[PDB]
């Protein structure tokens, strides 16, 4: 939860990540040559959680 200035006052914003966008960046970068990074931190049991 973060704050953002809207016109003399502030709005409180809660950020939710996108699951469908993460799946489509990874498919469209497995067959490409622009720089990329693989993150190997999540286990199988925690992914099911």
């Amino acid at each position: 939860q973060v704050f953002f200035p809207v016109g003399g006052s502030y709005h409180l914003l809660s950020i939710l990540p996108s699951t469908v966008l993460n799946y489509e960046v990874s498919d469209r970068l497995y067959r490409s040559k622009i720089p990329k990074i693989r993150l190997r931190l999540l286990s199988s049991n925690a992914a099911s959680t």
Binding site: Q1, F4, L12, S14, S18, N22, E24, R38, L39, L41
Partner: protein, 255 residues
């Protein structure tokens, strides 16, 4: 009643956040603009009227926490997790989520507008910057806080600017294909995060950080950017990031 420019020169930031769900690298621009707003809010409680209306981001060196393999790819590193609140807080080993951290040396150009902009303002900024953070990282040291007048009093470095024209004029069939094609044509551009977009309406829900404000559920939006040197630059105004708010969109733009 007066307008000027203040330069925060060569600041070391250690362990700043570097993960925005599709990007691992430079932190989002909203963190830097929030650092500027936090400095503004702390200066106005010491009864010193000032207003920061624009920030320019200059880069001198960087280091990503990790290593490079023999194939030329990065492998990130994370600290060992400690006790985390929940149902398994009394255990000895905790869970490992997704994280990334970066180290930076940078310089900031601030456009200030107030009743008085002398060097006592610079002394107050020097006294108020040892109690703040940038992204989620700590400040180890700075070099000097000073006023500037023209483009020739700026130290050498590379600024960051918006390149939305190179994204709207490329390929087709979706925006992500335009992103990938525009990154394959010219090799000196990077993807950056530039703000938030709404996913609901404005109201009050249970569980907020401050229970007296308005609330909206948001999603991060991403754009393209590039680097320009400080000796090939046209004007100060063409490298200053500002806030812009439509109905449902919370952005950071270069006009």
């Amino acid at each position: 009643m007066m307008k000027g420019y203040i330069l925060l020169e060569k600041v070391n930031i250690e362990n700043a956040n570097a993960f925005n769900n599709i990007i691992v690298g430079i932190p989002a621009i909203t963190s830097f603009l929030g650092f500027a707003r936090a400095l503004e809010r702390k200066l106005n409680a010491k009864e010193i009227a000032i207003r920061i209306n624009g920030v320019g981001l200059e880069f001198h060196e960087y280091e990503l926490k990790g290593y490079k393999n023999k194939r030329g790819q990065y492998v990130t590193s994370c600290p060992l997790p400690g006790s985390i609140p929940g149902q398994n807080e009394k255990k000895l080993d905790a869970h490992i989520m997704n994280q990334a951290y970066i180290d930076l040396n940078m310089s900031f150009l601030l456009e200030v507008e107030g009743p008085h902009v002398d060097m006592s303002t610079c002394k107050s900024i020097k006294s108020t910057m040892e109690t703040l953070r940038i992204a989620g990282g700590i400040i180890r040291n700075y070099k000097k806080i000073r006023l500037i007048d023209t483009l020739a009093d700026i130290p050498y470095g590379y600024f960051l600017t918006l390149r939305q024209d190179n994204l709207n004029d490329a390929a087709g069939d979706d925006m992500l294909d335009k992103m990938i094609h525009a990154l394959q044509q010219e090799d000196t551009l990077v993807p950056i995060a530039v703000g938030f977009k709404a996913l609901s309406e404005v109201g009050h829900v249970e569980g907020q950080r401050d229970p007296e404000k308005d609330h909206c559920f948001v999603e991060s939006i991403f754009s393209l950017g590039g680097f320009e040197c400080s000796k090939i630059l046209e004007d100060i105004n063409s490298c200053l990031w500002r806030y812009k708010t439509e109905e449902g969109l919370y952005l950071c733009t270069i006009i």
